């Protein structure tokens, strides 16, 4: 999908977009007050090299922040995640693939309310993209989850293991 920044509200000030990745926003803008998903899903970041707290924009026009009830200003990295066919995950209780193993097929509203885990340690990303959340209903700080072997929570760019929820990315068109 596509994708169009605006630093001011009312999709105003600071005008740039992409089709691709951007791992460092620095030289083209610091935030984004409004923003327009043209298409896809695009995993934002409070800081460049893919750090800091995730952002997960779905295709729309928001014509301020706060239309999605956003976290911080803090736009200074982006992520494409294209469609995915299938999706197939593996919660695990330690980090290294260890301990309770609980593979996952389907968008969890609440893990806390499902398998009673509010933090996990490691994931498996079996196939597929998902993306893992901070708080339930699919709120708080948004950690995109690759089709791959999550070692630990410091994988996915994540200062701490708090999971409570998760959902399948979908390429909205």
Same mark, same amino acid.
């Given at each position: 999908?596509?994708?169009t920044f605006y630093?001011?509200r009312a999709?105003?000030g600071?005008?740039?977009?992409?089709?691709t990745?951007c791992p460092?926003?620095?030289?083209?803008?610091?935030?984004?007050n409004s923003?327009?998903? #043209?298409?896809?899903?695009? &995993?934002?970041? #409070?800081r460049?090299?893919?750090?800091?707290?995730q952002?997960?924009?779905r295709r729309?026009?928001?014509?301020?922040?706060?239309?999605?009830?956003?976290?911080?200003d803090?736009?200074?990295?982006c992520?494409?995640?294209?469609q995915?066919?299938?999706?197939?995950?593996?919660?695990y209780?330690?980090?290294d693939?260890?301990?309770? &193993?609980?593979?996952?097929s #389907?968008?969890?509203?609440?893990?806390?309310?499902?398998f009673?885990?509010?933090e996990?340690?490691?994931l498996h990303?079996?196939e597929?993209?998902?993306v893992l959340? #901070?708080l339930?209903?699919?709120?708080?700080?948004?950690?995109?989850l690759?089709p791959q072997?999550?070692r630990?929570?410091?994988?996915?760019?994540?200062?701490?293991?708090?999971?409570?929820?998760?959902?399948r990315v979908?390429d909205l068109?």
């Amino acid at each position: 999908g596509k994708i169009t920044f605006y630093e001011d509200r009312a999709f105003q000030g600071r005008s740039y977009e992409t089709t691709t990745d951007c791992p460092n926003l620095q030289p083209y803008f610091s935030r984004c007050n409004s923003i327009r998903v #043209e298409s896809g899903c695009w &995993m934002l970041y #409070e800081r460049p090299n893919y750090q800091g707290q995730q952002y997960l924009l779905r295709r729309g026009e928001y014509p301020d922040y706060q239309q999605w009830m956003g976290l911080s200003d803090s736009i200074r990295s982006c992520c494409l995640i294209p469609q995915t066919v299938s999706h197939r995950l593996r919660l695990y209780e330690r980090e290294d693939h260890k301990g309770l &193993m609980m593979e996952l097929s #389907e968008d969890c509203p609440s893990i806390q309310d499902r398998f009673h885990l509010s933090e996990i340690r490691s994931l498996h990303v079996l196939e597929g993209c998902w993306v893992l959340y #901070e708080l339930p209903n699919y709120r708080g700080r948004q950690y995109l989850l690759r089709p791959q072997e999550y070692r630990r929570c410091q994988d996915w760019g994540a200062m701490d293991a708090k999971a409570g929820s998760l959902r399948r990315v979908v390429d909205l068109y």
